[PDB]
Amino acid sequence: SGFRKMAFPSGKVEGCMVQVTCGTTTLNGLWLDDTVYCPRHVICTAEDMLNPNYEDLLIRKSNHSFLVQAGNVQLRVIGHSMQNCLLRLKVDTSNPKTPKYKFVRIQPGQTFSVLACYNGSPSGVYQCAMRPNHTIKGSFLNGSCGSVGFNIDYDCVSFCYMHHMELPTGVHAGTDLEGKFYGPFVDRQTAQAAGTDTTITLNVLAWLYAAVINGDRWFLNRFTTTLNDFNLVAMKYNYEPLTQDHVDILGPLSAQTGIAVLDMCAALKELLQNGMNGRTILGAAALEDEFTPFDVVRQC
Amino acid sequence: SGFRKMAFPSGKVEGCMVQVTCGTTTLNGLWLDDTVYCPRHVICTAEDMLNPNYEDLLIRKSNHSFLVQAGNVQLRVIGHSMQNCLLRLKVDTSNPKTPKYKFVRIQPGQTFSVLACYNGSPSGVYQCAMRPNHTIKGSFLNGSCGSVGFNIDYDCVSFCYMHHMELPTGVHAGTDLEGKFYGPFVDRQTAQAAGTDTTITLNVLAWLYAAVINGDRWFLNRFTTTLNDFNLVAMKYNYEPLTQDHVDILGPLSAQTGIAVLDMCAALKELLQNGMNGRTILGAAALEDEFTPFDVVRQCSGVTF
């Protein structure tokens, strides 16, 4: 009955991780059935990343150029095709561990589990949220490229992210499982930057509801607010504006705590204005926003 | 790379999770080769939790009393025996997913990952620490009893925790995989409470070396301290006394940054006396105490399994 940053169990994804090498470059690939997805920049080398032409680089590559490996075993790549920023290699072996899966594109503010990898082997798993500026603040040392974010519903894995690169600020950028980047980024060593990021207002409130559900109700107050006035304040603090939609989503949690949503806004409003009094919420000494209402409901 | 709180990949432990039932009581079990480990209070029903005689209740228990399930399939239990607060069920089938493994008892301040399960099916994995008062600030709903905690080494899974129960505090308590409780707790619905917690000073130091490694180093200074002086401060802020033995466990991290342990203590000392000044460390508004010296080497030196 506590509150941990939880990830989905990583098992189904672990049995999908492989290693993909081209010359001196190695990163991670996701092996599903007879297909291996990985970031297309596994083909660039040195003075390529300096704006390269992937069509041009790919056409010059042969199926034997790709050294794919599941543990000891190489897998024979018997075909390929680019799809936006991914490579979709074909192989002569099917992965018997392939779980029920689908590809989904995820909205900013949502969360997922990341199984970080290096040379095809799992290092660790962790939960995070897609920032509103489309970056993710993960733990990603060079070589982790091709790690995947995923969600798990019952038996079925929804892949939503593959890591590609780190930005200057030190945050990370990637694509869905169809090669589409998240955010206005390109896989080239051109100097790009993160859009400004806001705090995920919807998540903070869910987190605050999770505090209450756990016997922590010190931040609560008696006043209320309109949606209008809460936004006027929250946006001053670089919080994302709040929509009636966001309010409804908080419906079940309010029902469960008895605390009205705008009242909880009134609480957050006060927390934003008046520091935090050195007090802690769920052990945190700042406000958390990498928890969705779904998550809170799930864990609590 | 940022710096997150990572759990170990849970696949190998997922492969050993099962469902154990005695009448109405359904919890989780750990299936290794032909043994299933679960908390012995699975035998209890209702007010048996109120100080029960496990020795006598079990004497009346018969093998087929136990309903053990992996996925849809039933695992025939063909024998049982108690080991402190655990049941050891014998089954007719060796677990084909049994990983290389061992049991170890963990010490206060050490960390590990928990795979929280329900009806023998995993729901989530997270990273927590064994508190100084011998509790764990976990996340458990009812049904999670039998959920296990582990660390992985190369290929070898080290099981160190099996969840039994929650305290009035909202914290959690359970055993090593030999049935031995952590701290002074017994598996009975009686009146037990956790002692006051302290901040795991060793870990906070590790967390600070971590920051430095990531180039987050605004908090260092050109000064040092003694154990005694650092301890006279720490203890005012409810930090655990740092021992010479602790100092040695930081050796790898102090060598990799070339910053002496006592030199970092002096910086910690000043963080305590002067707060953080609105600034952050690894983006955190506060000091982290649940990353071990080991966790850091691991996560900052891309170690896989």
Per DSSP, the residues of A4-26 read: ---B---HHHHTTEEEEEETTEE
Strands B172-175 and A25-32, by their bridges, are unpaired
- On chain B, the residues whose CB falls within 8 A of the CB of A9 are 10-11, 14, 115, 122-125
Nearest residue on chain B to A296, alpha-carbon basis: B139
Residue where one domain finishes, among candidates A173, A197, A221: A197
Nearest residue on chain A to B128, alpha-carbon basis: A4
Kindly state the helix (H) or strand (E) to which residue A229 belongs, with its residue range. Answer: helix A227-234
Choose from A125, A154, A156 for mutation: most chain B CBs within 10 A. A125
Same domain, B108 and B234: no
CB contact burial B171-191 (16+ within 10 A = b; e otherwise): bbbbbbbebebbbebebbbee
By Cβ distance, the residue of B284, B285, B304 closest to A122 is B304
CATH number of the domain within which B158 lies: 2.40.10.10
3-state secondary structure B211-263: HHHCCCCCCCCCCCCCHHHHHHHHHHHCECCCCHHHHHHCHHHHHHHCCCHHH
By Cβ distance, the residue of A2, A117, A284 closest to B137 is A2
Catalytic residue among B16, B22, B117, B145: B145
* B128–A6 CB contact, under 8 Å: no
Same domain, A32 and A166: no
* A140–B303 CB contact, under 8 Å: no
Kindly compute the dihedral angle of the four CA atoms of residues B253, B255, B260, B266, in this order, to the nearest 10 degrees: -30
Alpha-carbon gap: B141 to the closest alpha carbon of chain A (Å): 6
Same domain, A67 and A205: no
- On chain B, the residues whose CB falls within 8 A of the CB of A215 are 170
Same domain, A9 and A136: yes
Same domain, B168 and B63: no
By Cβ distance, the residue of A11, A124, A170 closest to B6 is A124
**Dist CA B124 CA B192 (whole Å):** 28
Asked whether B219 and B281 are in contact (CB, 8 A), the reply is yes
Residue where one domain finishes, among candidates B164, B197, B230: B197
Same domain, A210 and A290: yes
3-state secondary structure of B29: strand
Method for this entry: X-ray
Rg of chain B in Å (alpha carbons): 22
Same domain, B288 and B188: no
B134 is catalytic: no
Same domain, A155 and A261: no
Total structural domains in chain B? 3
Catalytic residue among B16, B22, B41, B172: B41
Q: Which domain holds residue B9?
A: 1-14+100-197
Asked whether A63 and A74 are in contact (CB, 8 A), the reply is no
Q: Which of B185, B167, B189 has the alpha carbon at shortest distance from B52?
A: B189
Strands A156-166 and B25-32, by their bridges, are unpaired
Asked whether B35 and B86 are in contact (CB, 8 A), the reply is no
- On chain B, the residues whose CB falls within 8 A of the CB of A128 are 4
Same domain, B7 and B118: yes
**Dist CA B163 CA B149 (whole Å):** 8
Q: Within 10 Å of residue B215's Cβ, how many Cβ atoms?
A: 7
**Dist CA A293 CA A203 (whole Å):** 6
CA B199 to chain centre: 16
3-state secondary structure A36-97: EEEEHHHCCCCCCCCCCCHHHHHHCCCHHHCEEEECCEEECEEECCEECCEEEEEECCCCCC
Q: Which residues contact B282 (CB under 8 A, 6 or more apart)?
A: B2, B3, B207, B210, B211, B214, B216, B288
Same domain, B6 and B106: yes
**Dist CA B141 CA A281 (whole Å):** 20
Residue where one domain finishes, among candidates B197, B221, B236: B197
CA A251 to chain centre: 25
Same domain, A129 and A262: no
**Dist CA B145 CA B116 (whole Å):** 9
Same domain, B142 and B267: no
**Dist CA A67 CA A119 (whole Å):** 12
* B1–A140 CB contact, under 8 Å: yes
In terms of phi and psi (left: phi > 0; alpha: psi -120 to 50; beta: otherwise), the region of B210 is: alpha
